[PDB]
Amino acid sequence: YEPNVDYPNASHAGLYDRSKQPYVDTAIGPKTTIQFDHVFIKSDFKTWLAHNQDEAILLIRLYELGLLLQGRSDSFLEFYNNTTYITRTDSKQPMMNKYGKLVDTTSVTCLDIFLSVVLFALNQIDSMICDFKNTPWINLSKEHKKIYELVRGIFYCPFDANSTASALNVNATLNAKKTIELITCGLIRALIAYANLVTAFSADKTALLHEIL
Amino acid sequence: YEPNVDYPNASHAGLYDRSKQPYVDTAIGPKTTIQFDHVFIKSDFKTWLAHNQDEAILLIRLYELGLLLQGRSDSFLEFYNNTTYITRTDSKQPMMNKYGKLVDTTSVTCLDIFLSVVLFALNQIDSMICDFKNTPWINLSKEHKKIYELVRGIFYCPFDANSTASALNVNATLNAKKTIELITCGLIRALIAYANLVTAFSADKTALLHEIL
Ligand SMILES: [Ca+2]
Ligand SMILES: [Ca+2]
What we know:
The structure is a homodimer.
Chain A: H1 3-6, H2 8-12, E1 33-36, E2 39-42, H3 44-51, H4 53-69, H5 73-77, H6 93-104, H7 108-133, H8 142-154, H9 164-212
Antiparallel strand pairs in A: 1-2
The complex binds calcium ion (2 copies).
Pfam families (chains A, B): NV_polyhedrin (PF24177)
GO molecular function (chains A, B): metal ion binding
Protein name (chains A, B): MOBP
């Protein structure tokens, strides 16, 4: 028995509400709901995207990578269209635009496709790192060389300059390993984000199952 | 148009089937399905548990940790009951027993509870590692000291022995950092497992939504 939970708008007009953005939790529209068969629920998945915009854009970047790895040529090549500006703005402008459209996407069908492509990219990257690290001598399969360079892209000895030649040979592996440490840190952050986001989506679907009955 | 996909048992009697365990894919029972409101689907989630038993037991261990961190005292303290043997067997025997019961669990309601507790444990561990690493000097919050020791548990200088005293002071941090590297590797593996498992569960729920209509 918790009237403050049944009546959240009335609760927000009290003296003991500590919410950071009162009343946002009852705003209803495409940006805060999902639907299956045009039955709507207020979506934990949409709330996550709003609370965690920074990580959501990291996952959108993975979607773009997934598209290229699935040969979705047109989707990939048009992914930065319709940005309007002829000048620089946010460094992540095309990703920010897609984030807005993802927030606007209500159908479970379309959101299933999004998470499926992101997970495909995450598994591809994990498989490439396992291959990198399975022997101290670095040897990658053909497909994993491609994944290595794709992730790397979509994301001197002043005392005796002649000695830099030897330094470069020694350092080639340090640079590759540094790339993999960076990719590994990005993957852990993307995985913790994905785990939480898809659990929120899973809980939203239970809510839909309850309501569709 | 793919008759071999509509008629998988007939396909398994052909000359071009490469499946590793033909006919397993049409076995129907509690161990291969889930249900909502007693509407059943053949479950990707159950197939994952069967293909990935090793990782499933890692996630079950996280459930047990989650229980202790949520104060579920009775569930925790009884979690190794009913093992029958008075001798040693599989090193993971109580976890193996629980794995069998998880595979036997059909209701979406109960499986939601499982994943929710596991995710709680994963987030707790990630938060503890972020705290460990946020300064080179190691300082953990009170709650994170507890999480550090819980995860660590649930999972000499022969030339001049006197010098070991100094060695131990130097090595205390190396041991703690080694623990965190080990925990970090376990977390990445648990996260990649969880990502795939809960996506399979999410896809199963879409299948249920389609069928419940
Ligand atoms: Ca290799
Ligand atoms: Ca700290």
